[PDB]
Amino acid sequence: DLEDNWETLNDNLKVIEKADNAAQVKDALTKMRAAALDAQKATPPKLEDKSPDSPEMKDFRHGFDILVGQIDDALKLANEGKVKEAQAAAEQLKTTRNAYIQKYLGSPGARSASSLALAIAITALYSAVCAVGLLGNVLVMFGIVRYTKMKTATNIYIFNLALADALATSTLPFQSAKYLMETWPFGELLCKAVLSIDYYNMFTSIFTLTMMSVDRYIAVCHPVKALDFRTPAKAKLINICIWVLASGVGVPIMVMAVTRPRDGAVVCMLQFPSPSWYWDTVTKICVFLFAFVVPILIITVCYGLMLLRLRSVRLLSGSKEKDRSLRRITRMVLVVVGAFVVCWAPIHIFVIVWTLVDIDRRDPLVVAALHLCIALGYANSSLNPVLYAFLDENFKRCFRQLCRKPCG
């Protein structure tokens, strides 16, 4: 209510300076006056702790009284067709606004300024995530393809995470541009690509982590039975099944993703069939369930039992060297899974809150928090290759060898 009044007041001052004619000035003055009278009835957030009779609230009201009277005088000029004189009076309005109202409401366009500062912060973070995650995950993929010692079932699942992570990080410079420009300049096909990739990363990542966790559970807790379940070839086939299952959501996203005009700009968005708010809500609930709660419950059972096994048995296999290896690989999986949960839980919860709950969605701290949770979800992509290199001696060694011989 007050926020909107303050913007309209300030926006219309600008219209007046830009006006071609008296009618445009009269119209803008008329809106400024309406906005001013509404603002005058309200309490600034800063003054919530004060009496209506305090020197602060007296001052705030006095300012709008002065402003309204100046608008009344300028309207008489505009009504009589005197555009230059009307425009000149709008200059005096800035003085009043600055001396009395900005005191309490903050600088005009402070909200816009925060939006821009956030977009610049997002761009910087997204550029870092993109560089580390794209380059890092491409190396992981080439490394696994190149080396025989790298083709283990666990690492075939890691290949799947890397593919998703490479795709997602490749979108980030486009998303940055969108945030800075406050519009989508890239056309509909790229919109479909970016939205689809975004959802495929979300679904394939968690499906892959669930299968990695089950695979590791089998390896650690059922080592004899494991021979009948675990091979690199089987993990590769499960990866394909993961992408096919994820396409259940992916292909509908591909179809529904469109560019639409919205408030002078172009938005890249999902067009749900009617009633759109309903299918949006159903989809968000299903994402919360099947991309977050359900796989995390599965993983938690496997995770807890792996922890119990690791402390309840002296040796997981024949030799201390190999035991050590199985324990190290298991720890790496547990860290990767843990890092995923820490990076993605905040945004999963926040999407549900934003969609279903009556929060203040235009509040800058709430918007910044939301965007930081989104960024944290992407940052998981850049984190992973770093985790693999520090937690698995074979990744470290094969990263070095790949770089020694890029072409063999």
Ligand X SMILES: CCCCCCCC/C=C\CCCCCCCC(=O)O
How many residues line the site for ligand OLC (CB under 6 A)?
A: 38
Per-residue b or e along 242-262, where b marks 16 or more CB atoms closer than 10 Å to that residue's CB = bbeebbebbebbbebbebeee
Residue 76 tokens, joined: 């008489």
* Bridge partner list, 258: 269
Among 100, 157, 174, 203, binds ligand X (CB under 6 A): 174
Among 108, 295, 377, 385, binds ligand OLC (CB under 6 A): 295
| Span 379-398, contacts to ligand X by CB under 6 A | 379, 383, 386, 390-391
Residue 293 tokens, joined: 């709660």
Alpha carbons 291 and 78: distance in angstroms, whole number: 60
Residue 335 contacts residue 387 (beta carbons within 8 Å): yes
DSSP assignment, residue 178? H
Residue 113's alpha-carbon distances to 106, 126, 366, in angstroms, are 12, 20, 16
Q: Which stretch binds ligand EJ4 (CB under 6 A): 147-155, 169-177, 180-188, 374-382?
A: 374-382
Residue 373's alpha-carbon distances to 96, 180, 260, 268, in angstroms, are 40, 18, 26, 20
Residue 317's CB is within 10 A of a number of other CB atoms, namely: 16
Residue 398 contacts residue 368 (beta carbons within 8 Å): no
Q: Identify what 315 binds: ligand X, Na ion, ligand EJ4, none; CB under 5 to 8 Å per kind.
A: none
Q: How many angstroms from the chain centroid is the CA of residue 39? A: 33
Q: How many angstroms from the chain centroid is the CA of residue 283? A: 18
| Span 164-193, contacts to Na ion by CB under 5 A | 164-165
262 backbone dihedrals φ, ψ, rounded to 5°: -150, 110
Among 227, 241, 286, 315, binds ligand OLC (CB under 6 A): 241
Interface with ligand OLC includes 211 (CB under 6 A)? yes
Among 378, 388, 395, 399, binds ligand EJ4 (CB under 6 A): 378
Among 77, 164, 171, 198, binds ligand EJ4 (CB under 6 A): 198
Interface with ligand OLC includes 248 (CB under 6 A)? yes
Q: Which stretch binds ligand OLC (CB under 6 A): 4-12, 69-77, 79-87, 159-167?
A: 159-167
Q: Is the dihedral of CA 29, 100, 47, 360 positive or negative?
A: positive
Interface with ligand X includes 329 (CB under 6 A)? no
Q: Which stretch binds ligand OLC (CB under 6 A): 175-183, 192-200, 335-343, 364-372?
A: 192-200
Q: Identify what 386 binds: ligand EJ4, ligand OLC, ligand X, none; CB under 5 to 8 Å per kind.
A: ligand X
Q: How many angstroms from the chain centroid is the CA of residue 73? A: 48
What track of x and - describes contact with ligand OLC for positions 113 through 152 (by CB under 6 A)?
A: -------------------------------xx-----x-
Among 88, 244, 293, 342, binds ligand OLC (CB under 6 A): 244
Interface with ligand OLC includes 273 (CB under 6 A)? yes
**In the bound complex, what is the minimum distance in angstroms from residue 168's beta carbon to Na ion?**
6
Residue 111 tokens, joined: 């909200």
Interface with ligand EJ4 includes 179 (CB under 6 A)? no
Interface with ligand X includes 117 (CB under 6 A)? yes
Burial class of residue 42, CB neighbours in 10 A (0-12, 13-18, 19+): middle
Residue 360 tokens, joined: 């203040």
Q: Identify what 170 binds: Na ion, ligand EJ4, ligand X, none; CB under 5 to 8 Å per kind.
A: ligand X
Residue with tokens 């945004």: 347
Residue 337's alpha-carbon distances to 161, 215, 290, 302, 368, in angstroms, are 11, 13, 16, 11, 26
Q: Which of 331, 327, 324, 339 is nearest to 376 (CA)?
A: 339
Residue 150's CB is within 10 A of a number of other CB atoms, namely: 22
Interface with ligand OLC includes 210 (CB under 6 A)? yes
Binding stretches for ligand EJ4 (CB under 6 A): 198-199, 202, 284, 287, 347-348, 351, 354, 374, 377-378
Contact footprint for ligand OLC (CB under 6 A):
144-145, 151, 156, 159-160, 163, 189, 192-193, 196-197, 200, 207, 210-211, 236, 238-245, 247-248, 251-252, 254-256, 258, 271, 273, 290, 294-295
Question: Which residues of the chain form contacts with ligand X (CB under 6 A)?
Answer: 117-118, 120-121, 124-125, 128, 138, 141-142, 145, 166-167, 170-171, 173-174, 177, 185-186, 193, 307, 331, 334-335, 338-339, 341-343, 345-346, 349-350, 353, 357-360, 363, 365-366, 368-369, 379, 383, 386, 390-391
